[PDB]
Design an enzyme around this catalytic site. Sequence first.
Site, PDB file in Angstrom:
ATOM      1  N   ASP A 183      25.928   3.608  -6.901  1.00 56.79           N
ATOM      2  CA  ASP A 183      26.568   4.304  -6.414  1.00 56.79           C
ATOM      3  C   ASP A 183      27.951   4.041  -6.045  1.00 56.79           C
ATOM      4  O   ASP A 183      28.650   4.211  -4.902  1.00 56.79           O
ATOM      5  CB  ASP A 183      26.066   5.394  -5.402  1.00 56.79           C
ATOM      6  CG  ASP A 183      26.969   6.520  -4.780  1.00 56.79           C
ATOM      7  OD1 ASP A 183      26.819   6.886  -3.593  1.00 56.79           O
ATOM      8  OD2 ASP A 183      27.704   7.116  -5.705  1.00 56.79           O
ATOM      9  N   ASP A 199      26.580   1.513   1.554  1.00 63.07           N
ATOM     10  CA  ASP A 199      25.737   2.545   0.860  1.00 63.07           C
ATOM     11  C   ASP A 199      24.896   2.225  -0.013  1.00 63.07           C
ATOM     12  O   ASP A 199      25.058   2.612  -1.283  1.00 63.07           O
ATOM     13  CB  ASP A 199      26.856   3.896   0.619  1.00 63.07           C
ATOM     14  CG  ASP A 199      26.056   5.080   0.560  1.00 63.07           C
ATOM     15  OD1 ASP A 199      24.976   5.441   0.976  1.00 63.07           O
ATOM     16  OD2 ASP A 199      26.750   6.045   0.015  1.00 63.07           O
TER      17      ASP A 199
HETATM   18  N1  LIG Z   1      29.239  -0.845   8.500  1.00 61.46           N
HETATM   19  C1  LIG Z   1      29.869   0.120   8.948  1.00 61.46           C
HETATM   20  N2  LIG Z   1      31.203  -0.241   9.569  1.00 61.46           N
HETATM   21  C2  LIG Z   1      32.032   0.663   9.817  1.00 61.46           C
HETATM   22  N3  LIG Z   1      31.861   2.034   9.237  1.00 61.46           N
HETATM   23  C3  LIG Z   1      30.767   2.106   8.333  1.00 61.46           C
HETATM   24  C4  LIG Z   1      29.843   1.204   7.938  1.00 61.46           C
HETATM   25  N4  LIG Z   1      28.820   2.003   7.235  1.00 61.46           N
HETATM   26  C5  LIG Z   1      29.409   3.049   7.044  1.00 61.46           C
HETATM   27  N5  LIG Z   1      30.609   3.382   7.617  1.00 61.46           N
HETATM   28  C6  LIG Z   1      31.442   4.654   7.619  1.00 61.46           C
HETATM   29  O1  LIG Z   1      30.477   5.739   7.317  1.00 61.46           O
HETATM   30  C7  LIG Z   1      30.755   6.302   6.027  1.00 61.46           C
HETATM   31  C8  LIG Z   1      29.523   6.956   5.425  1.00 61.46           C
HETATM   32  O2  LIG Z   1      28.445   5.772   5.289  1.00 61.46           O
HETATM   33  P1  LIG Z   1      27.646   5.742   3.904  1.00 61.46           P
HETATM   34  O3  LIG Z   1      26.818   4.621   3.972  1.00 61.46           O
HETATM   35  O4  LIG Z   1      28.873   5.827   2.651  1.00 61.46           O
HETATM   36  O5  LIG Z   1      26.934   6.972   3.791  1.00 61.46           O
HETATM   37  P2  LIG Z   1      27.284   8.530   3.255  1.00 61.46           P
HETATM   38  O6  LIG Z   1      27.641   8.334   1.805  1.00 61.46           O
HETATM   39  O7  LIG Z   1      25.810   9.078   3.189  1.00 61.46           O
HETATM   40  O8  LIG Z   1      28.025   9.361   4.159  1.00 61.46           O
HETATM   41  C9  LIG Z   1      31.474   5.292   5.430  1.00 61.46           C
HETATM   42  O9  LIG Z   1      32.148   6.040   4.305  1.00 61.46           O
HETATM   43  C10 LIG Z   1      32.422   4.719   6.508  1.00 61.46           C
HETATM   44  O10 LIG Z   1      33.540   5.488   6.460  1.00 61.46           O
HETATM   45 MN   LIG Z   2      28.637   6.591   0.816  1.00 60.99          MN
END
Ligand SMILES: Nc1ncnc2c1ncn2[C@@H]1O[C@H](COP(=O)(O)OP(=O)(O)O)[C@@H](O)[C@H]1O
Ligand SMILES: [Mn+2]
EC number: 2.7.11.1
Length: 245
Positions: A183, A199
Site C-alpha cells: 500500500d 502503514d
Molecule cells: N509513527 C507516526 N508518527 C507520527 N504520525 C503518524 C505515525 N504513524 C501514523 N501517523 C499519522 O497517522 C496517519 C494514519 O496512519 P496510518 O498508519 O497511515 O493508518 P491509516 O491509513 O489506517 O489511517 C498517518 O497518515 C500519519 O498522518
Molecule cells: Mn495509511
Amino acid sequence: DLKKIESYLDKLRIKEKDGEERKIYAEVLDGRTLKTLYKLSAKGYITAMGGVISTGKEANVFYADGVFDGKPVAMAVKIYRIMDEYLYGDERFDMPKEKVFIWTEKEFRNLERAKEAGVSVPQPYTYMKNVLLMEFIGEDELPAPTLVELGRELKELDVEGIFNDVVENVKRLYQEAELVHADLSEYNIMYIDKVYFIDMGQAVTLRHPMAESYLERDVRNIIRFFSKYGVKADFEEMLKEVKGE
Ligand SMILES: Nc1ncnc2c1ncn2[C@@H]1O[C@H](COP(=O)(O)OP(=O)(O)O)[C@@H](O)[C@H]1O
Ligand SMILES: [Mn+2]
C-alpha cells in the site's frame, strides 16, 4: 460501556479542557481498548496520552509521551478497531476479534523486519492486543506531513532526491527485508529530513503469491506521484533496481 469509557478517560487524564480530545477518544475507542492503554500505562510504556493524530475506518492514531528502553520517547499509538487477501497467503500467520489482534502483530512484525533491514520506518516499541506503540515521526506533538500533505511545497525541495530516497527504501525492503509494502503511496510516506514508510499491517513476504503484483503496483504509484513534480522515471528501470536485476 459508556460509563466504562468515561471512567478510563478519567484514569488516563484525558480532560475536558484538552480540546475536542475527550469526545473523540470516547467515540472512536471502546472500553476494552482503554483498559489496554491503561495497562500499557501501568506497565510504564505510556506516561501520558496526548492529542488525536488520525481517525480512520480501520485505525486511530494518537500522540503519547512514554518510555522505551529506559528513556522518555514520543510515541504514535496506533489502535486497530475491533484485510483477507493480505493475511491468507502470508504463511507466517497461522489462520473477528482475534483477527484484529493478528493484524496488529503483523504490522509490528513488519516494522521490526523492515527496521532490521535498514528501511526507514518508525522504530517499533511494543504491541498489545489491538494497540501498537512506535516512534513518533514529527516534532512538538505535530506529525511530519505525508507527501500528499507536503503538496506543492514539494516543488521547493529536492524532489528528485526524495524520489531516490523512496526508491532506495523500497529496494531495501525487497532485497533485505524480503517484504513488499503493498500500500505504498504518497498517503503512506512521511517526510522530515528523510522519508519514512508507514502503514504496514498489509505488507507481505516474497513467499506471498501476490507479492510481485503488489510490488508493481507500489512502483507504478510512486512513478505516478512523482511525475506530477517533474521527476522522470521508467517503470522497467525502477522495478529492476528494486529487485536487483
Ligand atoms: N509513527 C507516526 N508518527 C507520527 N504520525 C503518524 C505515525 N504513524 C501514523 N501517523 C499519522 O497517522 C496517519 C494514519 O496512519 P496510518 O498508519 O497511515 O493508518 P491509516 O491509513 O489506517 O489511517 C498517518 O497518515 C500519519 O498522518
Ligand atoms: Mn495509511
